[PDB]
Swiss-Prot record, chain A:
Component of the MCM2-7 complex. The complex forms a toroidal hexameric ring with the proposed subunit order MCM2-MCM6-MCM4-MCM7-MCM3-MCM5. Component of the CMG helicase complex, a hexameric ring of related MCM2-7 subunits stabilized by CDC45 and the tetrameric GINS complex. Interacts with ANKRD17. Interacts with MCMBP. Interacts with TONSL; the interaction is direct. This is DNA replication licensing factor MCM5. Early fractionation of eukaryotic MCM proteins yielded a variety of dimeric, trimeric and tetrameric complexes with unclear biological significance. The MCM2-7 hexamer is the proposed physiological active complex. The gene is MCM5. It comes from Homo sapiens (Human). The chain holds residues 26 to 245 of 734 of the full protein. Signal peptide: none annotated. It is linked to Meier-Gorlin syndrome 8: A form of Meier-Gorlin syndrome, a syndrome characterized by bilateral microtia, aplasia/hypoplasia of the patellae, and severe intrauterine and postnatal growth retardation with short stature and poor weight gain. Additional clinical findings include anomalies of cranial sutures, microcephaly, apparently low-set and simple ears, microstomia, full lips, highly arched or cleft palate, micrognathia, genitourinary tract anomalies, and various skeletal anomalies. It is found in: Nucleus; Chromosome. Belongs to the MCM family. Acts as a component of the MCM2-7 complex (MCM complex) which is the replicative helicase essential for 'once per cell cycle' DNA replication initiation and elongation in eukaryotic cells. Core component of CDC45-MCM-GINS (CMG) helicase, the molecular machine that unwinds template DNA during replication, and around which the replisome is built.
From Swiss-Prot, chain B:
The chain holds residues 458 to 678 of 904 of the full protein. It comes from Homo sapiens. The modification Phosphoserine is found at residue 27. The gene is MCM2. It is found in: Nucleus; Chromosome. ADP binds at residues 73-74. Early fractionation of eukaryotic MCM proteins yielded a variety of dimeric, trimeric and tetrameric complexes with unclear biological significance. Specifically a MCM467 subcomplex is shown to have in vitro helicase activity which is inhibited by the MCM2 subunit. The MCM2-7 hexamer is the proposed physiological active complex. This is DNA replication licensing factor MCM2.
Protein backbone atom coordinates (compact mmCIF):
# COMPACT_ATOMS: atom_id res chain seq x y z
CA UNK A 1 0.00 0.00 0.00
CA UNK A 2 2.43 2.66 1.21
CA UNK A 3 5.14 1.09 -0.95
CA UNK A 4 3.06 2.12 -3.97
CA UNK A 5 3.12 5.70 -2.68
CA UNK A 6 6.91 5.47 -2.27
CA UNK A 7 7.17 4.19 -5.85
CA UNK A 8 5.05 7.14 -6.98
CA UNK A 9 7.39 9.49 -5.10
CA UNK A 10 10.38 7.92 -6.85
CA UNK A 11 8.57 8.30 -10.19
CA UNK A 12 7.94 11.99 -9.49
CA UNK A 13 11.57 12.48 -8.45
CA UNK A 14 12.80 10.88 -11.68
CA UNK A 15 10.38 12.85 -13.86
CA UNK A 16 10.87 16.19 -12.10
CA UNK A 17 14.55 16.47 -11.13
CA UNK A 18 16.50 19.12 -13.05
CA UNK A 19 17.84 23.70 -15.70
CA UNK A 20 17.53 20.56 -17.84
CA UNK A 21 15.86 17.23 -17.06
CA UNK A 22 19.02 15.24 -16.34
CA UNK A 23 17.57 11.83 -15.45
CA UNK A 24 14.70 12.05 -17.95
CA UNK A 25 16.99 12.71 -20.93
CA UNK A 26 19.59 10.24 -19.67
CA UNK A 27 16.98 7.48 -19.39
CA UNK A 28 15.55 8.32 -22.81
CA UNK A 29 18.99 8.21 -24.44
CA UNK A 30 19.97 4.98 -22.68
CA UNK A 31 16.72 3.28 -23.70
CA UNK A 32 17.10 4.47 -27.30
CA UNK A 33 20.71 3.28 -27.55
CA UNK A 34 19.75 -0.07 -26.01
CA UNK A 35 21.65 0.29 -22.71
CA UNK A 36 19.01 -0.59 -20.13
CA UNK A 37 20.91 0.76 -17.11
CA UNK A 38 21.17 4.11 -15.32
CA UNK A 39 23.37 5.53 -12.57
CA UNK A 40 21.76 7.57 -9.78
CA UNK A 41 23.70 9.98 -7.56
CA UNK A 42 22.22 9.89 -4.06
CA UNK A 43 23.11 13.54 -3.44
CA UNK A 44 20.51 14.47 -6.07
CA UNK A 45 17.93 12.28 -4.31
CA UNK A 46 18.77 13.89 -0.96
CA UNK A 47 18.38 17.34 -2.51
CA UNK A 48 15.02 16.39 -4.02
CA UNK A 49 13.71 14.60 -0.92
CA UNK A 50 15.76 13.61 2.13
CA UNK A 51 13.22 11.02 3.34
CA UNK A 52 13.73 8.50 0.53
CA UNK A 53 17.50 9.03 0.60
CA UNK A 54 17.56 8.24 4.32
CA UNK A 55 15.29 5.23 3.77
CA UNK A 56 17.63 3.82 1.10
CA UNK A 57 20.51 3.66 3.60
CA UNK A 58 18.72 1.26 5.98
CA UNK A 59 16.51 -0.96 3.77
CA UNK A 60 18.14 -1.15 0.32
CA UNK A 61 16.52 -4.43 -0.76
CA UNK A 62 12.92 -3.19 -0.99
CA UNK A 63 13.55 0.45 -1.92
CA UNK A 64 15.87 -0.68 -4.73
CA UNK A 65 13.06 -2.76 -6.25
CA UNK A 66 10.65 0.15 -5.86
CA UNK A 67 13.13 2.49 -7.56
CA UNK A 68 13.66 -0.01 -10.38
CA UNK A 69 9.90 -0.27 -10.96
CA UNK A 70 9.58 3.52 -10.90
CA UNK A 71 12.42 3.87 -13.41
CA UNK A 72 10.79 1.28 -15.68
CA UNK A 73 7.49 3.19 -15.54
CA UNK A 74 9.28 6.48 -16.26
CA UNK A 75 11.05 4.95 -19.26
CA UNK A 76 7.73 3.57 -20.52
CA UNK A 77 6.06 6.97 -20.21
CA UNK A 78 8.94 8.81 -21.91
CA UNK A 79 9.10 6.47 -24.92
CA UNK A 80 5.51 6.33 -26.15
CA UNK A 81 6.10 6.19 -29.99
CA UNK A 82 8.43 3.20 -29.90
CA UNK A 83 9.12 1.56 -33.28
CA UNK A 84 7.00 -1.37 -34.45
CA UNK A 85 8.10 -4.73 -33.11
CA UNK A 86 9.59 -3.25 -29.94
CA UNK A 87 6.33 -3.47 -27.99
CA UNK A 88 7.92 -5.30 -25.06
CA UNK A 89 9.00 -3.05 -22.18
CA UNK A 90 12.35 -4.29 -20.87
CA UNK A 91 13.54 -4.10 -17.28
CA UNK A 92 16.15 -1.53 -16.22
CA UNK A 93 19.00 -1.92 -13.74
CA UNK A 94 19.69 0.94 -11.32
CA UNK A 95 23.16 1.65 -9.91
CA UNK A 96 24.14 3.83 -6.95
CA UNK A 97 26.91 6.39 -6.59
CA UNK A 98 27.94 8.76 -3.81
CA UNK A 99 30.83 11.01 -2.82
CA UNK A 100 30.97 9.81 0.81
CA UNK A 101 34.36 8.73 2.10
CA UNK A 102 34.85 4.93 2.22
CA UNK A 103 35.26 2.86 5.37
CA UNK A 104 37.97 0.32 6.12
CA UNK A 105 37.19 -3.34 5.46
CA UNK A 106 38.31 -4.15 9.02
CA UNK A 107 35.33 -2.19 10.40
CA UNK A 108 32.81 -4.77 9.14
CA UNK A 109 31.03 -6.27 12.15
CA UNK A 110 27.61 -7.59 13.17
CA UNK A 111 26.00 -4.14 13.37
CA UNK A 112 26.62 -3.55 9.65
CA UNK A 113 24.50 -6.55 8.61
CA UNK A 114 21.94 -5.95 5.85
CA UNK A 115 23.07 -2.31 5.58
CA UNK A 116 24.66 -0.37 2.72
CA UNK A 117 28.45 -0.21 2.91
CA UNK A 118 31.30 1.29 0.88
CA UNK A 119 34.69 -0.44 0.92
CA UNK A 120 38.00 0.04 -0.91
CA UNK A 121 40.16 -2.91 -1.93
CA UNK A 122 42.09 -4.73 -4.64
CA UNK A 123 40.74 -7.52 -6.85
CA UNK A 124 42.76 -10.74 -7.05
CA UNK A 125 40.35 -13.23 -8.66
CA UNK A 126 37.41 -13.02 -11.06
CA UNK A 127 35.31 -16.05 -11.99
CA UNK A 128 33.74 -16.62 -15.39
CA UNK A 129 30.39 -15.03 -16.19
CA UNK A 130 27.50 -17.48 -15.81
CA UNK A 131 23.72 -17.46 -16.16
CA UNK A 132 21.13 -17.25 -13.38
CA UNK A 133 17.38 -17.63 -13.82
CA UNK A 134 14.87 -14.91 -12.93
CA UNK A 135 11.56 -16.41 -14.13
CA UNK A 136 11.05 -20.18 -14.31
CA UNK A 137 8.28 -22.62 -15.18
CA UNK A 138 7.66 -26.14 -13.86
CA UNK A 139 5.71 -29.14 -15.13
CA UNK A 140 4.12 -32.09 -13.32
CA UNK A 141 5.02 -35.71 -14.02
CA UNK A 142 1.56 -37.28 -14.21
CA UNK A 143 -1.08 -34.70 -15.15
CA UNK A 144 1.42 -32.47 -17.03
CA UNK A 145 0.02 -29.32 -15.41
CA UNK A 146 2.19 -26.23 -15.65
CA UNK A 147 3.03 -23.38 -13.27
CA UNK A 148 4.49 -20.40 -15.12
CA UNK A 149 6.20 -17.09 -14.33
CA UNK A 150 7.60 -17.95 -10.90
CA UNK A 151 9.66 -15.01 -9.64
CA UNK A 152 13.16 -15.71 -8.34
CA UNK A 153 14.86 -13.69 -5.62
CA UNK A 154 18.11 -11.84 -6.37
CA UNK A 155 21.45 -12.73 -4.83
CA UNK A 156 22.82 -16.10 -3.76
CA UNK A 157 19.42 -17.51 -2.81
CA UNK A 158 17.84 -20.68 -4.17
CA UNK A 159 14.27 -21.84 -4.65
CA UNK A 160 12.23 -24.76 -3.31
CA UNK A 161 9.87 -26.59 -5.63
CA UNK A 162 6.38 -27.37 -4.26
CA UNK A 163 5.64 -30.91 -3.09
CA UNK A 164 1.83 -30.90 -3.41
CA UNK A 165 0.08 -30.98 -6.79
CA UNK A 166 -3.28 -29.22 -7.10
CA UNK A 167 -0.36 -37.65 -8.41
CA UNK A 168 2.82 -38.74 -6.63
CA UNK A 169 4.65 -36.50 -4.18
CA UNK A 170 7.36 -34.18 -5.54
CA UNK A 171 6.24 -34.51 -9.19
CA UNK A 172 7.49 -31.15 -10.50
CA UNK A 173 10.40 -30.68 -12.90
CA UNK A 174 11.99 -27.57 -14.39
CA UNK A 175 11.58 -26.92 -18.12
CA UNK A 176 14.78 -25.34 -19.49
CA UNK A 177 13.31 -23.91 -22.70
CA UNK A 178 10.93 -21.47 -20.96
CA UNK A 179 13.17 -19.49 -18.60
CA UNK A 180 14.69 -16.00 -18.56
CA UNK A 181 18.34 -15.69 -17.52
CA UNK A 182 20.78 -12.91 -16.62
CA UNK A 183 24.55 -12.71 -16.28
CA UNK A 184 26.29 -12.97 -12.91
CA UNK A 185 29.89 -13.14 -11.73
CA UNK A 186 31.83 -13.69 -8.50
CA UNK A 187 34.93 -11.74 -7.48
CA UNK A 188 37.53 -11.84 -4.70
CA UNK A 189 38.66 -8.66 -2.92
CA UNK A 190 41.69 -8.21 -0.67
CA UNK A 191 42.58 -5.52 1.85
CA UNK A 192 44.70 -2.70 0.46
CA UNK A 193 48.42 -3.12 1.30
CA UNK A 194 48.62 0.57 2.24
CA UNK A 195 46.05 0.09 5.02
CA UNK A 196 46.99 -3.32 6.48
CA UNK A 197 48.29 -3.10 10.07
CA UNK A 198 51.98 -3.80 10.56
CA UNK A 199 52.78 -7.41 11.36
CA UNK A 200 49.25 -8.65 10.64
CA UNK A 201 47.84 -10.79 7.86
CA UNK A 202 45.37 -9.21 5.41
CA UNK A 203 41.70 -10.16 5.18
CA UNK A 204 39.53 -10.99 2.19
CA UNK A 205 35.95 -10.70 0.99
CA UNK B 1 51.05 18.09 24.60
CA UNK B 2 53.89 18.47 27.10
CA UNK B 3 55.96 16.12 24.93
CA UNK B 4 56.08 18.74 22.17
CA UNK B 5 57.34 21.36 24.63
CA UNK B 6 59.94 18.91 25.96
CA UNK B 7 61.13 18.18 22.41
CA UNK B 8 61.39 21.89 21.63
CA UNK B 9 63.36 22.46 24.84
CA UNK B 10 65.69 19.58 23.95
CA UNK B 11 66.24 21.06 20.48
CA UNK B 12 67.41 24.28 22.14
CA UNK B 13 70.36 22.38 23.61
CA UNK B 14 73.69 23.20 21.97
CA UNK B 15 74.86 19.55 21.95
CA UNK B 16 71.62 17.86 20.87
CA UNK B 17 73.19 16.41 17.72
CA UNK B 18 76.08 14.82 19.60
CA UNK B 19 73.64 13.37 22.14
CA UNK B 20 71.52 11.89 19.34
CA UNK B 21 74.60 10.43 17.64
CA UNK B 22 75.85 8.86 20.88
CA UNK B 23 72.38 7.55 21.78
CA UNK B 24 72.23 5.08 18.89
CA UNK B 25 73.45 1.54 19.72
CA UNK B 26 74.33 1.86 23.43
CA UNK B 27 75.46 -1.78 23.56
CA UNK B 28 77.85 -1.44 20.59
CA UNK B 29 81.30 -0.08 21.40
CA UNK B 30 82.99 2.29 18.97
CA UNK B 31 82.01 2.90 15.34
CA UNK B 32 80.93 6.52 15.81
CA UNK B 33 80.82 7.17 12.06
CA UNK B 34 78.50 4.19 11.53
CA UNK B 35 76.13 5.51 14.21
CA UNK B 36 76.20 9.00 12.68
CA UNK B 37 75.40 7.62 9.23
CA UNK B 38 72.58 5.51 10.65
CA UNK B 39 71.16 8.59 12.40
CA UNK B 40 71.28 10.51 9.12
CA UNK B 41 69.54 7.64 7.33
CA UNK B 42 66.89 7.35 10.06
CA UNK B 43 66.02 11.05 10.00
CA UNK B 44 65.90 11.03 6.20
CA UNK B 45 65.39 13.85 3.74
CA UNK B 46 62.64 15.21 1.50
CA UNK B 47 61.56 13.90 -1.92
CA UNK B 48 61.00 16.35 -4.77
CA UNK B 49 59.01 16.26 -8.01
CA UNK B 50 58.86 19.36 -10.22
CA UNK B 51 55.60 18.72 -12.00
CA UNK B 52 55.07 15.08 -12.89
CA UNK B 53 58.26 14.51 -14.88
CA UNK B 54 61.39 14.55 -12.66
CA UNK B 55 61.21 12.48 -9.48
CA UNK B 56 64.01 12.71 -6.89
CA UNK B 57 63.89 10.46 -3.83
CA UNK B 58 64.79 11.49 -0.30
CA UNK B 59 65.66 8.13 1.25
CA UNK B 60 69.25 7.50 2.36
CA UNK B 61 70.25 3.89 1.70
CA UNK B 62 73.13 2.49 3.75
CA UNK B 63 75.49 -0.38 2.96
CA UNK B 64 78.01 -1.80 5.44
CA UNK B 65 80.81 -4.14 4.38
CA UNK B 66 83.03 -5.67 7.02
CA UNK B 67 85.11 -8.58 8.18
CA UNK B 68 83.54 -11.30 10.35
CA UNK B 69 83.26 -10.50 14.05
CA UNK B 70 82.61 -6.76 13.70
CA UNK B 71 79.00 -6.87 15.01
CA UNK B 72 77.23 -5.92 11.79
CA UNK B 73 74.03 -7.76 12.74
CA UNK B 74 73.69 -5.97 16.08
CA UNK B 75 73.22 -2.62 14.32
CA UNK B 76 70.46 -4.11 12.16
CA UNK B 77 68.75 -5.63 15.20
CA UNK B 78 68.90 -2.31 17.07
CA UNK B 79 67.50 -0.45 14.04
CA UNK B 80 64.68 -3.00 13.79
CA UNK B 81 63.91 -2.47 17.48
CA UNK B 82 63.93 1.34 17.21
CA UNK B 83 62.08 1.76 13.92
CA UNK B 84 58.28 1.76 14.05
CA UNK B 85 57.96 0.03 10.65
CA UNK B 86 61.04 -2.14 10.07
CA UNK B 87 61.26 -5.41 8.14
CA UNK B 88 64.30 -7.65 8.67
CA UNK B 89 65.36 -10.28 6.15
CA UNK B 90 68.36 -12.40 5.21
CA UNK B 91 69.59 -13.35 1.75
CA UNK B 92 70.84 -16.77 2.82
CA UNK B 93 67.34 -18.27 2.75
CA UNK B 94 64.51 -19.64 4.90
CA UNK B 95 63.52 -16.09 5.82
CA UNK B 96 60.28 -15.39 7.66
CA UNK B 97 59.35 -12.66 5.15
CA UNK B 98 60.14 -13.19 1.48
CA UNK B 99 61.71 -10.68 -0.89
CA UNK B 100 59.60 -11.51 -3.97
CA UNK B 101 55.85 -11.19 -4.40
CA UNK B 102 53.83 -14.29 -5.26
CA UNK B 103 50.25 -15.58 -5.27
CA UNK B 104 49.60 -18.71 -3.24
CA UNK B 105 47.19 -20.41 -0.86
CA UNK B 106 48.37 -19.59 2.66
CA UNK B 107 49.36 -22.74 4.63
CA UNK B 108 47.60 -21.56 7.81
CA UNK B 109 44.49 -19.69 6.67
CA UNK B 110 44.06 -21.90 3.56
CA UNK B 111 43.01 -18.84 1.53
CA UNK B 112 44.07 -17.59 -1.89
CA UNK B 113 46.35 -14.64 -1.13
CA UNK B 114 48.78 -12.31 -2.90
CA UNK B 115 51.82 -11.90 -0.64
CA UNK B 116 54.12 -9.03 -1.56
CA UNK B 117 57.81 -8.86 -0.79
CA UNK B 118 59.44 -7.21 2.19
CA UNK B 119 60.01 -4.09 0.07
CA UNK B 120 56.27 -3.47 -0.35
CA UNK B 121 55.48 -4.27 3.29
CA UNK B 122 58.13 -1.71 4.27
CA UNK B 123 56.47 1.15 2.37
CA UNK B 124 57.34 4.40 4.16
CA UNK B 125 59.50 2.29 6.48
CA UNK B 126 62.87 0.55 6.80
CA UNK B 127 64.12 -2.66 5.17
CA UNK B 128 67.15 -4.41 6.67
CA UNK B 129 69.05 -7.04 4.67
CA UNK B 130 71.63 -9.41 6.15
CA UNK B 131 73.99 -11.56 4.06
CA UNK B 132 73.60 -9.24 1.07
CA UNK B 133 76.03 -11.25 -1.10
CA UNK B 134 74.21 -14.60 -0.79
CA UNK B 135 71.13 -13.53 -2.76
CA UNK B 136 69.95 -15.18 -5.98
CA UNK B 137 68.96 -13.65 -9.32
CA UNK B 138 65.31 -12.98 -8.45
CA UNK B 139 66.13 -11.09 -5.24
CA UNK B 140 68.80 -9.04 -7.01
CA UNK B 141 66.41 -8.06 -9.82
CA UNK B 142 63.65 -7.19 -7.34
CA UNK B 143 66.01 -5.04 -5.25
CA UNK B 144 67.35 -3.33 -8.38
CA UNK B 145 63.87 -2.41 -9.60
CA UNK B 146 62.75 -1.37 -6.11
CA UNK B 147 65.77 0.92 -5.74
CA UNK B 148 65.68 2.43 -9.23
CA UNK B 149 61.97 2.73 -10.07
CA UNK B 150 60.79 2.60 -6.42
CA UNK B 151 57.99 0.26 -7.52
CA UNK B 152 57.32 -3.44 -8.11
CA UNK B 153 55.42 -4.80 -11.12
CA UNK B 154 53.65 -8.16 -10.83
CA UNK B 155 52.18 -10.18 -13.71
CA UNK B 156 51.18 -13.59 -12.35
CA UNK B 157 48.12 -15.84 -12.53
CA UNK B 158 46.14 -13.30 -14.53
CA UNK B 159 46.95 -10.49 -12.07
CA UNK B 160 48.76 -7.38 -13.34
CA UNK B 161 49.61 -4.88 -10.61
CA UNK B 162 52.05 -2.10 -9.77
CA UNK B 163 52.85 -1.46 -6.11
CA UNK B 164 54.77 1.34 -4.41
CA UNK B 165 57.94 0.39 -2.53
CA UNK B 166 59.09 3.68 -0.97
CA UNK B 167 61.49 2.37 1.67
CA UNK B 168 64.96 2.94 3.08
CA UNK B 169 67.35 0.02 2.59
CA UNK B 170 70.12 -0.87 5.05
CA UNK B 171 72.31 -3.82 4.05
CA UNK B 172 75.18 -5.78 5.60
CA UNK B 173 77.86 -7.69 3.70
CA UNK B 174 81.28 -9.37 3.85
CA UNK B 175 84.24 -9.26 1.43
CA UNK B 176 84.77 -11.85 -1.29
CA UNK B 177 87.93 -13.35 0.19
CA UNK B 178 86.81 -13.12 3.81
CA UNK B 179 89.13 -10.18 4.54
CA UNK B 180 89.18 -6.66 3.11
CA UNK B 181 92.17 -5.85 0.90
CA UNK B 182 93.10 -2.13 0.92
CA UNK B 183 95.13 -2.58 -2.28
CA UNK B 184 91.91 -3.25 -4.24
CA UNK B 185 88.91 -1.00 -4.77
CA UNK B 186 85.59 -1.44 -2.97
CA UNK B 187 83.89 -2.76 -6.11
CA UNK B 188 86.52 -5.49 -6.59
CA UNK B 189 86.17 -6.62 -2.96
CA UNK B 190 82.39 -7.24 -3.11
CA UNK B 191 80.45 -9.76 -5.19
CA UNK B 192 77.86 -7.07 -5.98
CA UNK B 193 77.74 -5.22 -9.29
CA UNK B 194 78.50 -1.55 -9.87
CA UNK B 195 74.87 -0.47 -10.63
CA UNK B 196 73.69 -1.97 -7.33
CA UNK B 197 76.47 -0.24 -5.37
CA UNK B 198 75.74 3.07 -7.11
CA UNK B 199 72.26 3.16 -5.55
CA UNK B 200 73.51 3.31 -1.95
CA UNK B 201 74.20 6.81 -0.64
CA UNK B 202 76.47 5.73 2.25
CA UNK B 203 79.06 2.94 2.11
CA UNK B 204 80.88 1.91 5.30
CA UNK B 205 84.03 -0.23 5.42
CA UNK B 206 84.88 -2.09 8.64
CA UNK B 207 88.28 -3.71 9.22
CA UNK B 208 89.70 -5.89 11.99
CA UNK B 209 93.14 -4.38 12.57
CA UNK B 210 94.86 -5.52 15.77
CA UNK B 211 94.86 -2.60 18.21
CA UNK B 212 95.77 -3.85 21.72
CA UNK B 213 94.02 -1.03 23.61
CA UNK B 214 90.80 -1.27 21.59
CA UNK B 215 90.83 -5.06 21.91
CA UNK B 216 91.35 -4.81 25.68
CA UNK B 217 88.47 -2.34 26.05
CA UNK B 218 86.20 -4.51 23.89
CA UNK B 219 87.08 -7.59 25.94
CA UNK B 220 86.36 -5.70 29.16
CA UNK B 221 82.98 -4.59 27.80
N1 LIG C 1 82.14 -3.55 19.37
C1 LIG C 1 81.55 -4.62 19.92
N2 LIG C 1 80.95 -4.47 21.12
C2 LIG C 1 80.37 -5.54 21.68
N3 LIG C 1 80.27 -6.78 21.21
C3 LIG C 1 80.87 -6.90 20.02
C4 LIG C 1 81.52 -5.89 19.32
N4 LIG C 1 82.02 -6.38 18.12
C5 LIG C 1 81.67 -7.64 18.13
N5 LIG C 1 80.97 -8.02 19.24
C6 LIG C 1 80.45 -9.35 19.54
O1 LIG C 1 80.89 -10.23 18.53
C7 LIG C 1 79.98 -11.34 18.46
C8 LIG C 1 79.87 -11.82 17.03
O2 LIG C 1 78.48 -11.93 16.65
P1 LIG C 1 77.80 -10.89 15.68
O3 LIG C 1 76.43 -11.44 15.27
O4 LIG C 1 77.77 -9.55 16.29
O5 LIG C 1 78.73 -10.93 14.39
P2 LIG C 1 78.67 -10.37 12.90
O6 LIG C 1 79.64 -9.19 12.81
O7 LIG C 1 77.29 -10.12 12.45
O8 LIG C 1 79.32 -11.57 12.08
P3 LIG C 1 79.11 -12.36 10.72
O9 LIG C 1 80.16 -11.78 9.77
O10 LIG C 1 79.48 -13.81 11.05
O11 LIG C 1 77.70 -12.20 10.24
C9 LIG C 1 78.66 -10.89 19.10
O12 LIG C 1 78.31 -11.72 20.21
C10 LIG C 1 78.92 -9.44 19.52
O13 LIG C 1 78.41 -9.17 20.82
MG1 LIG D 1 75.67 -11.55 11.38
ZN1 LIG E 1 0.10 -33.06 -11.32
Amino acid sequence: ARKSQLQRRFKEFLRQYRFTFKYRDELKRHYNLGEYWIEVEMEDLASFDEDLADYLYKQPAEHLQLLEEAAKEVADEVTRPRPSGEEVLQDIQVMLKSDASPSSIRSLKSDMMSHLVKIPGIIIAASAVRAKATRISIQCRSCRNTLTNIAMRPGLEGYALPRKCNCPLDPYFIMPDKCKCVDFQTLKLQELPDAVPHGEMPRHM
Amino acid sequence: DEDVKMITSLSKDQQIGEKIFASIAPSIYGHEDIKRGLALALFGGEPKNPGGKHKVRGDINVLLCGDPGTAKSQFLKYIEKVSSRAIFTTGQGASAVGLTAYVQRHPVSREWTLEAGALVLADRGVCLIDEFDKMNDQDRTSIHEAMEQQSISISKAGIVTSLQARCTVIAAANPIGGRYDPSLTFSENVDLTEPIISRFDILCVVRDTVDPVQDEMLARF
